[PDB]
Amino acid sequence: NVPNGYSQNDIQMMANAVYGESRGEPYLGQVAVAAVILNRVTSASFPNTVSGVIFEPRAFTAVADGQIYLTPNETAKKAVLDAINGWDPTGNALYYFNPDTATSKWIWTRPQIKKIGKHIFCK
Numbered sequence: 083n084v085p086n087g088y089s090q091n092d093i094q095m096m097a098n099a100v101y102g103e104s105r106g107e108p109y110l111g112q113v114a115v116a117a118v119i120l121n122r123v124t125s126a127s128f129p130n131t132v133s134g135v136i137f138e139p140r141a142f143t144a145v146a147d148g149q150i151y152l153t154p155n156e157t158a159k160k161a162v163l164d165a166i167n168g169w170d171p172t173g174n175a176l177y178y179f180n181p182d183t184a185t186s187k188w189i190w191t192r193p194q195i196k197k198i199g200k201h202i203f204c205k
């Protein structure tokens with residue numbers, strides 16, 4: 083069922099992480115969050131497994147919210163497989179935030195790449 087390099091649990095948790103962050107966003111915004119997870123895996127500055135990236139303490143509200151082991155939203159799951167298949171609409175982003183609600187002081191310091199739906203994607 084799952085791309086080589088990933089477990090069933092990897093894909094489910096990615097889908098649940100993506101739904102947590104981007105439920106209701108344009109489909110492109112959901113692929114984008116998935117893209118960011120894969121970019122963080124690649125990056126030296128984040129963990130180097132999908133689990134490690136998803137379980138970073140503040141990172142994905144699906145973790146704190148008890149959603150990471152649920153049956154995944156089918157569209158968030160498609161977005162995940164789209165990103166694994168090489169769709170990265172964020173231009174290799176590592177960070178994102180919603181400028182209307184974000185309360186982080188430091189997020190505004192990241193170099194901004196583009197905005198998709200309610201999220202600005204950043205290096």
Ligand code: NA
Pocket residue numbers: 122123124125126127128129130131
């Ligand atoms: Na990494």
